[PDB]
Design a protein around this nucleic acid. Structure first.
Ligand SMILES: [Mn+2]
Length: 108
DNA sequence: TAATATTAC
């Protein structure tokens, strides 16, 4: 698994972490480049189970080399990892159901 | 892409 991107769009299905607790763990990820913006939202699956979406904007492009680098812990929570094609589309998408938290400053 | 999974611009 390989991604080189400035902006990451993450989706954690069947995830019971609070949005604040997931934001906390992602803030404390040691990455070479600095995180300028993290937004985490909590939404519900059709069966009532919660999941999270995350937008991370890094200061520069970040080479993800490992499919588990963004795994979170309470059980272990594994996300769908994609490079955000549009940071502004994702920002809107993460905000749409109203239950989200931000860290940092949104970029460009 | 893996590896959560129907959730993912
Ligand atoms: Mn959702």
């Amino acid at each position: 698994f390989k991604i080189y991107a400035k902006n990451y769009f993450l989706t954690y299905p069947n995830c019971s972490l609070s949005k604040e607790e997931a934001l906390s763990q992602l803030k404390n990820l040691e990455t070479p480049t600095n995180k300028k913006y993290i937004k985490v939202c909590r939404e519900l699956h059709e069966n009532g189970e919660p999941h999270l979406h995350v937008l991370i904007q890094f200061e520069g492009k970040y080479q993800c080399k490992n499919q588990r680098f963004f795994d979170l812990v309470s059980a272990h929570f594994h996300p769908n990892i994609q490079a955000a094609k549009s940071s502004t589309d994702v920002k809107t998408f993460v905000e749409k159901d109203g239950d989200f938290i931000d860290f940092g400053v949104f970029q460009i």
